[PDB]
Amino acid sequence: MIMVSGCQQQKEETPFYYGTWDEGRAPGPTDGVKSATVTFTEDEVVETEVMEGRGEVQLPFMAYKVISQSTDGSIEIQYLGPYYPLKSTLKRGENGTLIWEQNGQRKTMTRIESKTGREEKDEKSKSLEHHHHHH
């Protein structure tokens, strides 16, 4: 018998960075939210942190521009807003993850399974905050 080979290529776009990623590490102080998820939108990035008693809370969306890009390898982007001059690096990871590098820190993000062919709208919440989950 034989194993039927086949690979082809997708003409439909598949951006490896697009989606929702889990930053579900260990929590911190009052401003150290239990978990976080990052949502990548069209030209804006939306951060979400899951707060005890509040649930998922979406932060003010940050605009980004693509400086350099690959079809599937690494991506170089720069933010817009109060934190615009600091660019970030993105790379593909193992299993199906995204490697987010910022400030010299290397973060491995896992992709959550959602929007699998279903409209999922963002939420808008204005929070007066200075929360900083950090190492």
UniProtKB/Swiss-Prot annotation:
<keyword id="KW-0732">Signal</keyword>
<dbReference type="InterPro" id="IPR021664">
    <property type="entry name" value="DUF3255"/>
</dbReference>
<dbReference type="Pfam" id="PF11631">
    <property type="entry name" value="DUF3255"/>
</dbReference>
<protein>
    <recommendedName>
        <fullName>Uncharacterized protein YxeF</fullName>
    </recommendedName>
</protein>
<feature type="compositionally biased region" description="Basic and acidic residues">
    <location>
        <begin position="110"/>
        <end position="127"/>
    </location>
</feature>
<feature type="region of interest" description="Disordered">
    <location>
        <begin position="102"/>
        <end position="127"/>
    </location>
</feature>
<dbReference type="InterPro" id="IPR012674">
    <property type="entry name" value="Calycin"/>
</dbReference>
